[PDB]
Structure formats: C-alpha cells, structure tokens
Amino acid sequence: TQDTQLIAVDEKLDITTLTGVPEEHIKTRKVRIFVPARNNMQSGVNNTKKWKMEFDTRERWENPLMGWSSTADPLSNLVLTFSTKEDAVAFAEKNGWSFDVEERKVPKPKSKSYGANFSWNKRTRVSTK
Amino acid sequence: EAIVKNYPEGHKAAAVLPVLDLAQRQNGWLPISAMNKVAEILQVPPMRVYEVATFYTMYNRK
Amino acid sequence: PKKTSFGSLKDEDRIFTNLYGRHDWRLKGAQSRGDWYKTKEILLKGPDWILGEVKTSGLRGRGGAGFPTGLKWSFMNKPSDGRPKYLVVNADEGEPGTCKDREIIRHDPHKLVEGCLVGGRAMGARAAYIYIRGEFYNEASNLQVAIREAYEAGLIGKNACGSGYDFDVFVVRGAGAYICGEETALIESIEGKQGKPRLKPPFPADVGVFGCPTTVANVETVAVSPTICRRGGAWFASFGRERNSGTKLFNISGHVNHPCTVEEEMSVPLKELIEKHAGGVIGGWDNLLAVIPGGSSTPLIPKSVCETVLMDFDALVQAQTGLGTAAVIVMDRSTDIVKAIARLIEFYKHESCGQCTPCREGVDWMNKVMARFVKGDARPAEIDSLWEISKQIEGHTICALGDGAAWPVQGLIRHFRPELEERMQQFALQHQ
Ligand SMILES: Cc1cc2nc3c(=O)[nH]c(=O)nc-3n(C[C@H](O)[C@H](O)[C@H](O)COP(=O)(O)O)c2cc1C
Numbered sequence: 001t002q003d004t005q006l007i008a009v010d011e012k013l014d015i016t017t018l019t020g021v022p023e024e025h026i027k028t029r030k031v032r033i034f035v036p037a038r039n040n041m042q043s044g045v046n047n048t049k050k051w052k053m054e055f056d057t058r059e060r061w062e063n064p065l066m067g068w069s070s071t072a073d074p075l076s077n078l079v080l081t082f083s084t085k086e087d088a089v090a091f092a093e094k095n096g097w098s099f100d101v102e103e104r105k106v107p108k109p110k111s112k113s114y115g116a117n118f119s120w121n122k123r124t125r126v127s128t129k
Numbered sequence: 130e131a132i133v134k135n136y137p138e139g140h141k142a143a144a145v146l147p148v149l150d151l152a153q154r155q156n157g158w159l160p161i162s163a164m165n166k167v168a169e170i171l172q173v174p175p176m177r178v179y180e181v182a183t184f185y186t187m188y189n190r191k
Numbered sequence: 192p193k194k195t196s197f198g199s200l201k202d203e204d205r206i207f208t209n210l211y212g213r214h215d216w217r218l219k220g221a222q223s224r225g226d227w228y229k230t231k232e233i234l235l236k237g238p239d240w241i242l243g244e245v246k247t248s249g250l251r252g253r254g255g256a257g258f259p260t261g262l263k264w265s266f267m268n269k270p271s272d273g274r275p276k277y278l279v280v281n282a283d284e285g286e287p288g289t290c291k292d293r294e295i296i297r298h299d300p301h302k303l304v305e306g307c308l309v310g311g312r313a314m315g316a317r318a319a320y321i322y323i324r325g326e327f328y329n330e331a332s333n334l335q336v337a338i339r340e341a342y343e344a345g346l347i348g349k350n351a352c353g354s355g356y357d358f359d360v361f362v363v364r365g366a367g368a369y370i371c372g373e374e375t376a377l378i379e380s381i382e383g384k385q386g387k388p389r390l391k392p393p394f395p396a397d398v399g400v401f402g403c404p405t406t407v408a409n410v411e412t413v414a415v416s417p418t419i420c421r422r423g424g425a426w427f428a429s430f431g432r433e434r435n436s437g438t439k440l441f442n443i444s445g446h447v448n449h450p451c452t453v454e455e456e457m458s459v460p461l462k463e464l465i466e467k468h469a470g471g472v473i474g475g476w477d478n479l480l481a482v483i484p485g486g487s488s489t490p491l492i493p494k495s496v497c498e499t500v501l502m503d504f505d506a507l508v509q510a511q512t513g514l515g516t517a518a519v520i521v522m523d524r525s526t527d528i529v530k531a532i533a534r535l536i537e538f539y540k541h542e543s544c545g546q547c548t549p550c551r552e553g554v555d556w557m558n559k560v561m562a563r564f565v566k567g568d569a570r571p572a573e574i575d576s577l578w579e580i581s582k583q584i585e586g587h588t589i590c591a592l593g594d595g596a597a598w599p600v601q602g603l604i605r606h607f608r609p610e611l612e613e614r615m616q617q618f619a620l621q622h623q
C-alpha cells in the first residue's frame with residue numbers, strides 16, 4: 001500500500017485549523033444535509049438525485065443608497081453537492097460543522113390503471129374526459 | 130322518466146343526451162335554465178351538461 | 192371449383208331483400224321475406240355454434256375496419272363475472288359517402304333486430320344499444336316501430352322467441368358528431384359524457400358501456416348475422432375472394448350518372464360495378480379522374496389503378512388504400528381534386544373531438560395548409576412538409592380519426608403532386 005513507516009492515525013480527521021475559516025463561521029453555523037425537493041411548478045425529478053449541504057440564512061439588510069440586499073455572511077451562497085448522504089456527513093464532520101441530516105423522501109409507488117376511470121361498481125368512475 | 134328507466138340503475142347520467150334533446154323539443158333552443166334543469170332532473174353537475182351541450186352540434190345553445 | 196371473376200351477385204343470394212322499400216318493412220313483410228324465421232333453433236343451438244359458424248362464414252367487420260367478426264364476437268364467450276354483458280350496434284354513419292346503414296334501418300329494421308338478438312345470444316349479452324345518429328330521426332322512429340312490433344310478437348323481450356333468453360334492444364339517439372362513430376367514443380356518448388374516444392389498454396370485451404363488458408358491431412354485420420346462421424357459413428364463404436368473403440352494400444356517388452346503392456359480392460371489379468350498377472362515370476370511363484374507394488378515411492386512387500382493381504380489403508390494401516365502408520366516390524376530369532381533398536380535411540377538422548394533441552392541432556394545421564394549397568399560396572417544400580405532418584399525425588392519436596384524416600392527404604400528395612406544383616406555379620406567375 002504505502003511503505004513509508006505507515007502510521008496509525010485512528011483519531012478522527014479534522015482540518016478546522018487548515019481551512020482559514022474564522023472563529024465565528026465554524027460552530028455558530030449549522031449546515032443542512034438534504035435532498036432538494038422537486039419544484040412543484042415543474043414535473044421533473046432530475047434535481048432530486050444529489051444530496052446538498054447548505055448554511056443557515058443570516059441577516060440581509062437593505063443598502064441605504066440604492067436598496068441592495070446587503071449581507072455579512074460569507075457562507076450564504078455556498079452550497080455543496082454530494083453523491084451520497086454518508087459522504088456529505090463525512091465532509092461536515094471533517095470540517096467541524098454542526099449538521100442536521102434529513103432523510104431522502106421518495107415518491108411512494110402508486111397504482112395507476114386506465115380501466116378504473118370507467119369502473120362499473122366503484123366511485124373512481126370519472127364524470128368527464 | 131321512461132328514458133331514465135332505459136338505463137342501468139346508478140348510471141342515470143347516461144340519459145343526459147336524450148333528456149337535453151327533450152328540453153330542445155319543447156323549447157326550440159336550449160336556454161341555460163334548461164341546462165340547469167336537466168342537471169337537476171338528472172342529478173348531474175351542471176358543468177357536465179354544459180360540456181355535452183357545447184360539444185354536440187345539434188344542441189342549439191342560441 | 193373456385194370463382195375467378197367475383198361479381199354479378201344473384202338475386203336469390205342477397206342478404207337484404209328490401210333495399211329500396213319495395214316491400215313491407217313491418218313484421219308481416221319481413222316474415223314474408225324470410226326474416227324472423229326459425230330463430231328459436233338458432234337461439235337454442237348454443238352461442239358457441241353461432242360464433243363458430245360466423246367464423247366459418249369468414250365475415251369481416253363491415254363498419255370500416257377489417258377485423259374478423261367471428262374472433263371479435265368470440266372475445267365475449269368468456270364466463271360470467273357478475274357484471275352484465277352488452278352488445279352495441281353502431282349506426283352513427285358519419286363517414287362521408289356512407290349510405291348503407293340508413294337504408295337498412297329504414298327499410299329492413301327487423302333484420303337488424305334479429306341480428307341484435309342472435310348476436311347477443313352468441314356473446315351472452317343481456318341487452319342491445321343501437322346507437323343511431325341524431326339526424327336519422329325518421330330512421331330511428333321506423334326502427335323503434337319495428338322493435339315494438341317484435342316486442343308485441345314475443346320475438347324479443349322476456350323469453351325471446353320462447354328460447355328462455357331475455358334480451359332488450361334500446362336505441363340511443365346521437366347528437367350530431369362524426370367521432371361518435373368510433374366505438375369507444377360511442378361508448379362514452381352512450382354513457383352520457385362527450386364523444387371523446389377512450390384509449391385502448393382496456394378493451395370493450397373487458398370494460399365497455401357503464402363499465403360492463405360491451406362489444407360494438409356495425410349495422411351491416413349484425414343485420415347479415417341471422418342470415419349467416421340460417422343459410423350457413425359456407426354459403427357466405429362461397430362469395431368473394433379468400434379471407435374476403437361475403438356481400439357488401441356499395442354506395443356509389445360523386446360524378447356517377449346514376450348514383451345508387453347495391454348489394455354486390457366481395458372482390459368485385461371496380462370498373463364492372465361502376466358500369467353496371469351505377470351506370471358508369473359521367474362522360475365515360477375516360478372522363479374519370481379519381482376514385483375514393485371506401486369513404487373519406489380511405490385514400491383516393493387514380494384512374495390508371497381504377498382500371499383493374501378488385502373490391503376486397505386485400506386488393507385495395509395492395510393499391511395503397513383501404514376498402515373501408517365501400518363508399519365509392521368518383522371524381523371526373525372536371526373536378527378540382529385539391530378542392531375536394533381540402534373539403535374532406537375541413538370536414539375532419541370540424542369533426543375532431545380535440546382530445547389528443549395530434550388530431551386537435553395537427554388536423555387544423557393540415558386544413559390551413561390545404562386551404563393555401565387550393566389557391567396555390569405555397570412553395571414546393573410545403574408539400575413535403577404536409578407529408579411529414581401527416582406522418583406525425585399517423586399512429587399517434589387515441590382513435591383512428593387522426594389516421595383517417597392523414598390518409599387523404601397522403602393519397603392526394605402521392606397521386607397528384609404535379610397538380611399541386613403546377614397550381615402553385617400558376618399562382619406564383621399571376622402574383623407578379
Ligand atoms: C372516426 C371513426 C368513425 C367511425 N364511424 C363508424 C360508423 O359510422 N359506423 C360504423 O359502423 N363504424 C364506424 N367506425 C368503426 C368503429 O369504431 C368500429 O371499429 C366498428 O364499428 C366495429 O364493428 P365492425 O368490426 O363490425 O366494423 C368508425 C371509426 C372511426 C375511427
């Protein structure tokens with residue numbers, strides 16, 4: 001594997017001091033591991049297949065001159081993507097960020113049938129086409 | 130009532146097309162009041178009656 | 192052994208003996224003409240026997256399709272499942288060029304009633320729903336008069352003809368829609384909703400009117416069914432080519448000297464039928480420009496092909512068209528073929544139920560394109576564009592009305608592209 005006097009470093013990996021993140025933005029933040037919900041406006045599920053990690057929204061005030069959305073939170077527009085939940089939580093613990101993982105919701109398999117639209121005894125018989 | 134009897138029980142809406150036709154014969158054309166009266170006498174939502182009236186050509190809505 | 196020139200059907204072997212109302216159309220005249228005779232024996236023989244003899248007769252669907260009537264009817268020989276079983280006779284008759292059904296209803300209604308009886312017994316149906324179109328008010332009233340006569344005579348109703356069978360023949364009237372001729376659209380029209388056709392992952396043998404199993408047949412086939420039982424399957428099999436047996440009511444119109452309706456045997460020469468029964472094309476056979484064989488759905492065919500074409504399903508299929516409903520529409524050299532086909536497309540646009548996208552949007556687009564074509568307001572590329580649009584419509588609609596509207600365009604292009612090109616060139620030179 002690696003023959004260089006391969007050393008046991010069992011204790012968990014932590015690069016909190018090797019990222020440059022200031023004091024404030026490393027424990028008072030709370031990342032959120034979640035599979036994004038499908039935009040109910042559309043009907044495509046291609047945006048609900050990758051886990052995402054995001055940071056809590058902070059103060060967003062209005063600029064006195066023109067009215068922009070001024071903010072002082074550097075980790076506001078930064079959202080990471082991950083193939084699996086375990087990798088995302090590994091990244092969260094590696095960088096020392098508090099998390100709250102939400103399980104991936106999956107559409108329950110329905111039971112569609114064209115014939116039920118024109119049933120004879122049941123109430124699923126449609127009154128229009 | 131004879132026309133309704135000419136259909137299976139529980140599917141009275143099948144009489145919508147002839148019943149509406151009757152409303153034509155005694156009125157020439159089909160006023161919206163006739164539409165609602167057909168819906169009432171056939172226990173059918175008025176929208177379905179409006180749909181079948183606007184779809185078929187012989188029904189004179191004017 | 193085997194007949195070669197299938198034609199010149201004899202008067203003795205004709206299913207309908209009262210085409211033109213020359214005999215009493217009530218029960219008395221029908222019994223005088225062999226109708227309603229020995230029906231009890233057919234009723235008691237067994238549904239399997241009737242279905243088998245229908246298969247032996249080789250009867251194909253005489254309503255526009257070509258499905259074997261025996262197989263379609265035997266699709267209902269399944270055991271009971273609590274739900275009632277229903278036979279429905281389509282009498283919409285909305286396809287242009289069709290005139291047979293009206294004639295049989297208003298001249299031989301008792302044949303139709305006996306057909307519903309024998310068919311319902313064969314398929315185990317409890318009642319019949321003859322869906323006549325709204326316009327045929329006089330025809331519907333005549334049919335119901337014959338129904339009342341049969342009911343009084345005891346042929347139908349409780350203990351039909353004394354065989355212990357209980358059958359009813361309701362006649363539901365249409366409300367002026369050509370799409371109601373479609374069997375699933377007819378089913379919903381009977382059910383009270385609009386005449387939008389239903390998709391067919393489920394079939395009428397499983398789910399039909401009111402959800403109960405239903406089978407839609409045509410007026411002609413059910414009318415000939417009791418005659419098929421009486422005379423015999425082999426007697427029907429003798430007439431017409433193989434797999435194309437039986438006799439058909441050909442409705443001849445257009446630019447024919449004497450447009451009419453005749454009961455002629457299948458696979459008949461088109462030229463011979465036009466000359467004898469119809470009287471030939473106005474101005475002789477040389478004055479013939481085009482022939483629409485079986486109504487608007489079937490693509491037109493040019494005179495060169497019309498010279499020698501048998502009138503069976505397969506022969507016209509080889510001729511890049513269809514038998515359809517045997518609606519002969521002849522157009523002479525004084526006919527604007529573009530105008531006639533555009534009128535047919537306008538009819539289809541006015542009759543589209545609008546359910547599925549290809550028929551709702553495509554057919555209107557073809558109507559606009561053909562309207563521009565009639566005035567030659569286009570360029571040669573839009574002919575291929577129209578062909579592509581017609582192909583996109585084909586095989587993509589819920590019912591067959593989309594294909595029945597696309598086929599005339601394909602036939603017109605395939606056989607008269609130079610006419611469209613020259614008309615377009617004339618319009619281009621005039622607009623200078
Ligand atoms: C647009 C459209 C119109 C039709 N109109 C009729 C009609 O007027 N009469 C008819 O018998 N069949 C008509 N048919 C055919 C029926 O849908 C069905 O295939 C047929 O009635 C079944 O009986 P058959 O096998 O004896 O033809 C039509 C089909 C389509 C797609």
Ligand code: SF4
Nearest residue numbers: 544545546547550588
């Ligand atoms: S093809 Fe036309 S008539 Fe048939 S279902 Fe589609 S829209 Fe309706």
